[PDB]
Amino acid sequence: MKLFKELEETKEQVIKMAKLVQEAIDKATEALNKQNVELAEEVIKGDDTIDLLEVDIERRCIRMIALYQPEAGDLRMIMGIYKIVSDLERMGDEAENIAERAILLAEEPPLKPYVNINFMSEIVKEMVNDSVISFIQQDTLLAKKVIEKDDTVDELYHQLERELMTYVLEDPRNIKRAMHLSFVARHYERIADHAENVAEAAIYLSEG
């Protein structure tokens, strides 16, 4: 009885953790776009908080278990949350890194608008959001359509990857920037794989 309160905020902690990750990406992409160290500097010192939300939720879970010991579909949610919460941390971590490489791309002009990375990022934020609200609220049709999304991201990557190899196949100087940029794109694909893990874990835990 005393335990529902505990669990219901814990779920909202995860939801909050996810808005912060989404906003990291959002900042990270912007800082990369309108080239802006002062913004990536925000992203980087931002992880601090996400690392702590991770810690917190972990620490919340262990209390819920030792205090109450759940069973059946409840212990299954806590253990599952304990799990999806480090996926969330990694995601926000990738973000940290996107910001890292944005700092380095400030070291010279744009070789390209940065088109692709955006469409990716845009989609990616949508994934984070849902992959969680699919876990927490066990909507299988949502989780399934998130899983389906990761492959539009994939396109964009193995698509950019080919445009990014124009610039080297046509100019020596270039390499330095396109280099950082590849890294940057793989980060966004990672963020999706992460989220689609969470969507799998959801589909998993769910029909239990």
Short mmCIF file of C-alpha atoms in Angstrom, two decimals:
data_model
loop_
_atom_site.label_atom_id
_atom_site.label_comp_id
_atom_site.label_asym_id
_atom_site.label_seq_id
_atom_site.Cartn_x
_atom_site.Cartn_y
_atom_site.Cartn_z
CA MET A 1 0.00 0.00 0.00
CA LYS A 2 2.78 2.38 1.14
CA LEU A 3 4.51 1.19 -2.04
CA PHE A 4 2.39 2.66 -4.81
CA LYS A 5 3.40 6.20 -3.83
CA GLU A 6 7.04 5.11 -4.01
CA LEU A 7 6.59 3.51 -7.42
CA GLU A 8 4.50 6.25 -9.02
CA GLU A 9 7.07 9.01 -8.60
CA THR A 10 9.88 6.62 -9.48
CA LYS A 11 8.12 6.24 -12.84
CA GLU A 12 7.86 10.03 -13.14
CA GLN A 13 11.58 10.24 -12.31
CA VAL A 14 12.21 8.13 -15.38
CA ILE A 15 9.88 10.36 -17.42
CA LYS A 16 11.76 13.45 -16.16
CA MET A 17 15.10 11.78 -16.86
CA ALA A 18 13.91 11.35 -20.44
CA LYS A 19 12.85 14.95 -21.04
CA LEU A 20 16.34 15.95 -19.88
CA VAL A 21 18.02 13.52 -22.29
CA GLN A 22 15.78 14.76 -25.11
CA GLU A 23 16.73 18.31 -24.22
CA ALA A 24 20.43 17.37 -24.14
CA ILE A 25 20.20 16.12 -27.75
CA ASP A 26 18.15 19.15 -28.61
CA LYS A 27 20.81 21.47 -27.19
CA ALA A 28 23.60 19.32 -28.62
CA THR A 29 22.22 19.51 -32.16
CA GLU A 30 21.59 23.26 -31.87
CA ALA A 31 25.11 23.94 -30.54
CA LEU A 32 26.38 21.98 -33.53
CA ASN A 33 24.03 23.80 -35.91
CA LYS A 34 24.33 27.46 -34.99
CA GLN A 35 28.00 26.78 -33.93
CA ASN A 36 28.11 27.64 -30.22
CA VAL A 37 30.65 26.44 -27.59
CA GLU A 38 28.72 28.26 -24.79
CA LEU A 39 25.83 25.90 -25.54
CA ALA A 40 27.76 22.64 -25.67
CA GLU A 41 29.38 23.77 -22.42
CA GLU A 42 25.85 23.63 -21.03
CA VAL A 43 25.25 20.13 -22.41
CA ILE A 44 28.48 18.81 -20.89
CA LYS A 45 27.89 20.14 -17.37
CA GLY A 46 24.34 18.90 -17.86
CA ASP A 47 25.27 15.20 -17.86
CA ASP A 48 26.10 15.72 -14.17
CA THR A 49 22.38 15.85 -13.53
CA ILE A 50 21.50 12.91 -15.71
CA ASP A 51 24.18 10.76 -14.05
CA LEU A 52 22.49 11.63 -10.77
CA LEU A 53 18.98 10.94 -11.91
CA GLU A 54 20.38 7.54 -12.82
CA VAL A 55 21.96 7.15 -9.39
CA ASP A 56 18.75 8.36 -7.76
CA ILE A 57 16.41 6.00 -9.51
CA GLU A 58 18.78 3.05 -8.92
CA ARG A 59 18.88 4.02 -5.26
CA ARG A 60 15.07 4.45 -5.22
CA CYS A 61 14.59 0.92 -6.58
CA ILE A 62 16.82 -0.82 -4.04
CA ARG A 63 14.80 0.86 -1.23
CA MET A 64 11.48 -0.23 -2.79
CA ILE A 65 12.78 -3.84 -2.90
CA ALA A 66 14.27 -3.99 0.63
CA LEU A 67 11.46 -1.95 2.17
CA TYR A 68 8.54 -3.71 0.53
CA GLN A 69 9.68 -6.65 -1.63
CA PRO A 70 7.23 -6.72 -4.53
CA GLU A 71 6.33 -9.78 -6.61
CA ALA A 72 4.89 -10.67 -10.02
CA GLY A 73 4.35 -7.73 -12.31
CA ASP A 74 5.71 -5.18 -9.86
CA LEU A 75 9.15 -6.57 -9.08
CA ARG A 76 9.18 -6.94 -12.87
CA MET A 77 8.66 -3.18 -13.29
CA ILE A 78 11.31 -2.16 -10.74
CA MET A 79 13.95 -4.53 -12.05
CA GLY A 80 12.99 -3.36 -15.53
CA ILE A 81 13.23 0.28 -14.55
CA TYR A 82 16.56 -0.34 -12.80
CA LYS A 83 17.59 -1.65 -16.21
CA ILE A 84 16.15 0.85 -18.71
CA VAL A 85 17.58 3.61 -16.57
CA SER A 86 21.15 2.91 -17.48
CA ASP A 87 20.14 2.74 -21.17
CA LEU A 88 18.77 6.26 -20.64
CA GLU A 89 22.09 7.32 -19.08
CA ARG A 90 24.06 5.99 -22.00
CA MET A 91 21.72 7.86 -24.39
CA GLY A 92 22.33 11.12 -22.56
CA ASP A 93 25.98 10.18 -22.57
CA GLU A 94 26.06 9.97 -26.39
CA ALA A 95 24.55 13.44 -26.27
CA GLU A 96 27.44 14.62 -24.07
CA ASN A 97 29.75 13.36 -26.82
CA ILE A 98 27.83 14.97 -29.65
CA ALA A 99 28.46 18.23 -27.79
CA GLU A 100 32.11 17.27 -27.42
CA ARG A 101 32.56 17.00 -31.19
CA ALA A 102 30.53 20.18 -31.71
CA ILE A 103 33.22 22.04 -29.78
CA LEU A 104 35.78 20.66 -32.18
CA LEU A 105 33.75 21.53 -35.27
CA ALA A 106 33.68 25.10 -34.02
CA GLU A 107 37.42 25.02 -34.85
CA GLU A 108 36.50 25.86 -38.49
CA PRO A 109 33.59 26.75 -40.86
CA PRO A 110 30.67 24.36 -41.75
CA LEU A 111 31.69 22.01 -44.49
CA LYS A 112 28.02 21.33 -44.93
CA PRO A 113 24.66 22.76 -43.52
CA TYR A 114 24.51 19.50 -41.44
CA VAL A 115 21.13 18.57 -42.97
CA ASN A 116 21.01 14.86 -42.16
CA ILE A 117 22.14 14.97 -38.50
CA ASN A 118 19.00 17.02 -37.88
CA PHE A 119 16.39 14.70 -39.38
CA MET A 120 18.20 12.01 -37.36
CA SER A 121 18.21 14.07 -34.14
CA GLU A 122 14.56 15.01 -34.67
CA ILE A 123 13.54 11.38 -34.97
CA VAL A 124 15.87 10.36 -32.23
CA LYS A 125 14.23 12.67 -29.66
CA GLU A 126 10.87 11.15 -30.65
CA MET A 127 12.32 7.69 -29.89
CA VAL A 128 13.66 8.46 -26.41
CA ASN A 129 10.31 9.95 -25.46
CA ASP A 130 8.24 6.99 -26.57
CA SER A 131 10.62 4.10 -25.79
CA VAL A 132 10.09 5.20 -22.19
CA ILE A 133 6.34 5.99 -22.24
CA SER A 134 6.05 2.56 -23.91
CA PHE A 135 7.87 0.89 -21.08
CA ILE A 136 6.17 2.69 -18.20
CA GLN A 137 2.71 2.55 -19.75
CA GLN A 138 3.28 -0.82 -21.48
CA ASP A 139 1.69 0.24 -24.89
CA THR A 140 3.01 -2.51 -27.15
CA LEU A 141 1.78 -0.93 -30.41
CA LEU A 142 3.82 2.17 -29.48
CA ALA A 143 7.00 0.28 -28.63
CA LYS A 144 6.60 -1.72 -31.86
CA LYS A 145 6.39 1.46 -33.99
CA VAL A 146 9.49 2.83 -32.25
CA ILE A 147 11.39 -0.33 -33.12
CA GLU A 148 10.21 0.20 -36.70
CA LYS A 149 11.68 3.75 -36.58
CA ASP A 150 15.34 2.81 -35.93
CA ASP A 151 15.67 1.80 -39.54
CA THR A 152 14.77 5.19 -40.98
CA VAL A 153 17.62 6.46 -38.80
CA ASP A 154 19.87 3.73 -40.19
CA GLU A 155 19.09 4.95 -43.77
CA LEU A 156 20.20 8.45 -42.85
CA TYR A 157 23.45 7.20 -41.51
CA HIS A 158 24.51 4.83 -44.31
CA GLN A 159 23.17 7.71 -46.41
CA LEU A 160 25.21 10.54 -44.88
CA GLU A 161 28.17 8.14 -44.76
CA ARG A 162 28.06 8.15 -48.54
CA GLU A 163 27.69 11.95 -48.88
CA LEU A 164 30.45 12.35 -46.28
CA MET A 165 32.67 10.25 -48.56
CA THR A 166 32.10 12.69 -51.44
CA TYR A 167 34.00 15.45 -49.63
CA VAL A 168 37.06 13.37 -49.07
CA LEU A 169 36.86 11.86 -52.58
CA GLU A 170 37.02 15.45 -53.84
CA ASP A 171 39.19 17.46 -51.39
CA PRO A 172 42.16 16.70 -49.08
CA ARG A 173 41.70 19.51 -46.50
CA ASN A 174 38.13 18.37 -45.78
CA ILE A 175 38.92 15.12 -43.95
CA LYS A 176 39.34 16.77 -40.51
CA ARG A 177 35.76 18.01 -40.34
CA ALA A 178 34.05 15.02 -42.05
CA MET A 179 35.93 12.90 -39.57
CA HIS A 180 34.37 14.63 -36.53
CA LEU A 181 31.08 14.52 -38.35
CA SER A 182 31.03 10.77 -38.77
CA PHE A 183 31.61 10.21 -35.08
CA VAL A 184 28.76 12.71 -34.54
CA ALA A 185 26.30 10.81 -36.76
CA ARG A 186 27.17 7.41 -35.18
CA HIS A 187 26.28 8.97 -31.90
CA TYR A 188 22.80 9.69 -33.03
CA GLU A 189 22.38 6.10 -34.37
CA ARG A 190 23.60 4.79 -31.03
CA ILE A 191 21.02 6.87 -29.25
CA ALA A 192 18.39 5.06 -31.36
CA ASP A 193 19.74 1.54 -30.78
CA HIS A 194 19.63 2.34 -27.10
CA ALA A 195 16.08 3.51 -27.23
CA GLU A 196 15.05 0.51 -29.35
CA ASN A 197 16.59 -1.74 -26.69
CA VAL A 198 14.25 -0.09 -24.24
CA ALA A 199 11.36 -0.66 -26.66
CA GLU A 200 12.33 -4.39 -26.82
CA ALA A 201 12.58 -4.63 -23.03
CA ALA A 202 9.14 -3.03 -22.94
CA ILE A 203 7.54 -5.52 -25.38
CA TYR A 204 9.33 -8.06 -23.22
CA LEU A 205 8.31 -7.10 -19.66
CA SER A 206 4.84 -6.01 -20.98
CA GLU A 207 2.76 -9.10 -21.93
CA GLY A 208 3.81 -10.56 -18.57
#
